[PDB]
Every structure is written in C-alpha cells, then in structure tokens.
Amino acid sequence: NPPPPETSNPNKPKRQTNQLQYLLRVVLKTLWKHQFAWPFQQPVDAVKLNLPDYYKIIKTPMDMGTIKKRLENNYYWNAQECIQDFNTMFTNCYIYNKPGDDIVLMAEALEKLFLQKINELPTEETE
Numbered sequence: 001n002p003p004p005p006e007t008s009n010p011n012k013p014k015r016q017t018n019q020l021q022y023l024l025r026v027v028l029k030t031l032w033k034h035q036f037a038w039p040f041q042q043p044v045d046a047v048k049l050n051l052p053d054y055y056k057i058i059k060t061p062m063d064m065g066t067i068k069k070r071l072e073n074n075y076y077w078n079a080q081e082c083i084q085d086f087n088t089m090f091t092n093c094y095i096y097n098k099p100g101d102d103i104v105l106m107a108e109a110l111e112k113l114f115l116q117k118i119n120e121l122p123t124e125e126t127e
C-alpha cells in the first residue's frame, strides 16, 4: 500500500469559510451516515482486498476519511477544493470498475445524495 493523501502541510496557510464549515458539519455527516458509505470511509486497502493493480490505475486516490481530516486541518482553501475531492473519489470508483457493477452503483447512490446536499451550502462565501 502507498501512503494516503496527506491532510496538512505546514507551508500551506489555514483558511476556513462558511461553506467549508457547513461541508464538514452537515454534508459529510449525512454522507458518512448513508447506507453505502462504509467502502469510502477510509483509503482503499488494495492488499487485503486483493486489488494489486488498484494504485497503478488510480493515480489520485481519495476517500471521505482523508476528506474529513482535510476539512478539520483546514487543508482546503475554499469549498470548491473540497467538492473536487468527492468528484475524484467517485470517478476513481468509476475508472477502476466497469459500468453497472455493485460498487459503482453504491458510489452512484452516494454521489446523488452528495450533489443534493451541497446545493444547501451558502451561495455566498464568508471567511
């Protein structure tokens, strides 16, 4: 297994906005509760799951585990930077697997709730 994505770097300033606040307090909470959240709450263990080509195909892995630690350490500059990590987490499941698989359908159901909940983030960002 490779190192997981890092959740803080001492050279990057820390910034919090009202949207990043609502993103960890509400959206993540709902997404972490979903029925199909358990395969995406931590970095994929390609060894125990016997996926030897996973990290050779997925060059930018992502999970809600690291997304949460990034919201907590203020790794993200704005809300856009966080939303981009969910899209990449979803598309990873779509790139590595084939259409119509179960894990694909679990990520699709999990994405439809994500796009629904981020429509609740404040339309005007406040620092």
Ligand SMILES: O=C(NCc1cccnc1)c1cc(-c2csc3c(=O)cc(N4CCOCC4)oc23)cc2c1OCCO2
Residues within 6 Å of the ligand: 038, 039, 040, 044, 048, 049, 092, 093, 096, 097, 103
């Ligand atoms: O397969 C899983 N659970 C059932 C199980 C059965 C037997 C032994 N061990 C576990 C599983 C999959 C992902 C997970 C998150 S993203 C992602 C992906 O993109 C492709 C795969 N695959 C490909 C083929 O299907 C099985 C595993 O898995 C994942 C994350 C997980 C999983 O279970 C344990 C913890 O987190």
